């Protein structure tokens, strides 16, 4: 048996060296990762190692902010292994007694916060909390009573409304009839504001795991004067049950592993459109439908296709779209991507009549900035990246732009916008030649002259 004990002497340190940095670096953000990484070593023997690490975690002065994370981890570990919570309810309680005997209230604050949050998780019984509040009030250390009450008073009022309303009649008698110091006074009055309007608002900001994520195991302890904190907690203990402990840990680990792992819509929208006299009415009806964000693009597609069924363009569709766009940004982005969808994929399926309607429609929305002119960045006037459908579309779009804005305003809006794909000021010369050809041949050559200066330089 000597060889087995020697092996255990090494296994204990293996567990210690693996679980110590996990606890020492615990945070509310990485808690789940720490919880799963704890179970990759046999924790059923390392119960005492974890408990000693938790006690050291609460004693650390800087870890006051991270106590809720530690409490949630203790709750998870207690649900998987009740003995951890069993021994913590005693060791943290005795540690608080000790640190209160030495009057180091900074660490007492951490222990009381941890115990209160454990109370919120039903890891510890109410008895522990009422003993702690008896011990603090027989000394009149209100600064800790107030801190404990902010966190757990609302549960203590459900569980022990008798003693809870005694502690309130004591606390209020102090506030109303005793010569308090200001920093104490304003913290007591803020505890009264909390009870007055939202008694749970003292445990809002902590990390709160839902009750589904753990199983309730409640442990209790009664503090006697003879009892002393185990200063040798976490030291090696002979493990006569090593094999069965490993087998049980196998079952627990595999438990953790297994536990961790439209024609009618088109019709509806179409009928909304066809039942409306004005674009404002149609827009109102569609907005009142509260269409989900993922369906908005399909709605815009239905509006476009409906407008493409008409014999001509109609201001009705432009007003409708405009009202949708200005209502919310999700509609503006749905229209943006529908425009690039049309030019990139759908134009090949459109006949020249449909392209005429579509060009005028998008030109109208661009001419009023409902669709930003930056959307034209997807246009690439070249013999390879464009097709007759796209060029016919561009022709009608720009014709609408010039009809609504005039040459001067269109020229100024294009100049203030980077459109290298239509007015290449740099790059291959034949892209400049082809662009000036397109724009002059559609009659927009006045826009081209500025560009031609480069075309002339290219000849020399």
């Amino acid at each position: 048996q000597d060889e087995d004990i020697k092996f255990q002497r090494e296994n204990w340190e293996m567990i210690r060296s693996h679980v110590s940095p996990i606890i020492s670096n615990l945070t509310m953000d990485n808690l789940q990762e720490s919880h799963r990484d704890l179970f990759q070593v046999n924790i059923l023997i390392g119960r005492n190692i974890i408990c000693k690490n938790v006690v050291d975690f609460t004693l650390n002065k800087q870890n006051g902010r991270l106590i809720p994370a530690l409490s949630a981890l203790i709750a998870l570990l207690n649900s998987d292994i009740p003995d951890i919570g069993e021994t913590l309810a005693k060791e943290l309680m005795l540690m608080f007694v000790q640190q209160f005997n030495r009057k180091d209230y900074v660490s007492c604050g951490n222990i009381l916060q941890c115990l209160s949050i454990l109370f919120l998780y039903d890891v510890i019984h109410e008895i522990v909390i009422l003993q702690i509040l008896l011990l603090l009030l027989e000394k009149n250390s209100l600064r800790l009573v107030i801190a404990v009450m902010k966190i757990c008073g609302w549960k203590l009022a459900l569980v022990s409304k008798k003693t809870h309303d005694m502690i309130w009649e004591k606390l209020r008698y102090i506030l109303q009839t005793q010569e308090l110091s200001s920093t104490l006074r304003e913290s007591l009055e803020t505890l009264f504001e909390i009870r007055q309007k939202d008694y749970k608002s003292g445990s809002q900001g902590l990390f709160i795991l839902d009750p589904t994520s753990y199983t309730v195991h409640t442990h209790s302890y009664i503090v006697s004067d003879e009892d002393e904190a185990n200063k040798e907690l976490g030291n090696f203990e002979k493990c006569e049950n090593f094999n069965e402990l490993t087998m049980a840990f196998d079952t627990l680990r595999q438990k953790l592993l297994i536990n961790n792992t439209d024609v009618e819509f088109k019709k509806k929208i179409y009928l909304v459109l066809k039942s409306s006299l004005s674009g404002d009415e149609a827009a109102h009806k569609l907005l009142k439908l509260k269409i989900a964000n993922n369906l908005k693009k399909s709605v815009v597609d239905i509006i476009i296709k409906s407008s493409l069924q008409e014999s001509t363009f109609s201001k009705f569709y432009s007003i409708l779209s405009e009202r949708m766009i200005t209502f919310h940004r999700s509609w503006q982005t749905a229209y943006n991507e529908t425009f690039e969808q049309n030019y990139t994929q759908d134009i090949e399926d459109y006949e020249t009549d449909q392209l005429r309607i579509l060009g005028k429609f998008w030109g109208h929305l661009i001419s009023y900035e409902f669709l930003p002119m930056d959307c034209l960045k997807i246009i690439k006037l070249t013999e390879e990246e464009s097709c007759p459908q796209g060029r016919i579309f561009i022709k009608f779009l720009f014709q609408e732009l010039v009809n609504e804005l005039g040459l001067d305003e269109l020229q100024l809006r294009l100049n203030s916008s980077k459109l290298d794909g239509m007015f290449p000021l740099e790059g291959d010369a034949e892209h400049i030649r082809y662009s000036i050809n397109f724009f002059t041949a559609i009659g927009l050559g006045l826009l081209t002259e500025d560009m031609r200066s480069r075309l002339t330089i290219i000849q020399e």
């Binding site: 019709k267 179409y270 239905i302 409906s306 069924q309």
Partner: peptide, 14 residues
């Protein structure tokens, strides 16, 4: 014979 307004199919079907 069935009238045209019955025979014709709304765009959203096709």
């Amino acid at each position: 014979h069935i009238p045209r307004y019955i025979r014709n199919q709304p765009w959203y079907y096709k």
